[PDB]
Amino acid sequence: TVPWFPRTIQELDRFANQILSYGAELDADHPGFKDPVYRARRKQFADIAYNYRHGQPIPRVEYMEEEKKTWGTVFKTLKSLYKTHACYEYNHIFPLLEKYCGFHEDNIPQLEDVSQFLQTCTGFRLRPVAGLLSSRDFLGGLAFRVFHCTQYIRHGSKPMYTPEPDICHELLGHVPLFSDRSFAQFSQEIGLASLGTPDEYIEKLATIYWFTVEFGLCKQGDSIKAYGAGLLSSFGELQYCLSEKPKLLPLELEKTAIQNYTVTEFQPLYYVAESFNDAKEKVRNFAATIPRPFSVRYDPYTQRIEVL
Ligand SMILES: [Fe+3]
């Protein structure tokens, strides 16, 4: 048989009831483990994601001074590297995010405002997400240009560290790239390639996602820059990734999809994309080889996937 997949954007609502219910915040080594206030705050954000329904505005949240401080520290520290380390598309949109979304050290941008801004850029939109979605569900949302986004922030005791994505990572790492046309298309191609795809191939696409959307390097003229969200939200790894230490290889999906990696240390190897249009073409070609008895297409006019 073929695994179920949403045919309409509203159907993404099925995902909220298929996440991992025992999150990282519950682990003994989590920065906020012993903090009961943090614990309740996280549950509060998880309840918002749980009750969220496609089409609704994303609830605004008054962040505490402590949380704004953690955001400020992360913002301030990462900002210094973007001009020289981030890909052109990133730096091109950041000023706009600062002007229209309140991307500033003293303020944590609200997801609703960021979502509206993205929608006017590429039709991408955000949906608050509780915890960990399976790769199949996470990738599936991209097909509709929907990005499942965390709303909670890392624990304040370790502002430069997070064992999971949190709002700083989503907004400083992912968001600026989703405002780029080609990137949006490229991201969506991965999502489309995952619809109704067999588990074994979902894993291949998750790995490709890891080496592009999360830890990708882009060719820029005769130079190289970072566009991966995991890099763009990592002070240490962002500087490291463009140094002489890591091994760099051309994005080549047949090899990239099988490549192992660990999410604990700096990546020893990175794949370099020629451009987002090219990475998009490569994904499309790779999707072609995935054994699926059907073809899928997204119709932005009706917000439905057409199955051939
Ligand atoms: Fe991420």
Curated annotation (Swiss-Prot):
Changing H148L: In PAH deficiency; severe; uncertain significance. Changing A143V: In PAH deficiency; severe. Changing D13Y: In PAH deficiency; severe. Changing R125H: In PAH deficiency; severe. Changing R127Q: In PAH deficiency. Changing Y209C: In PAH deficiency; severe. Changing I202T: In PAH deficiency; severe; partial loss of activity. Changing K158E: In PAH deficiency; severe; likely benign. It is an enzyme of class 1 (oxidoreductase). Changing F294S: In PAH deficiency; mild. Homodimer and homotetramer. This is Phenylalanine-4-hydroxylase. The gene is PAH. The chain holds residues 117 to 424 of 452 of the full protein.
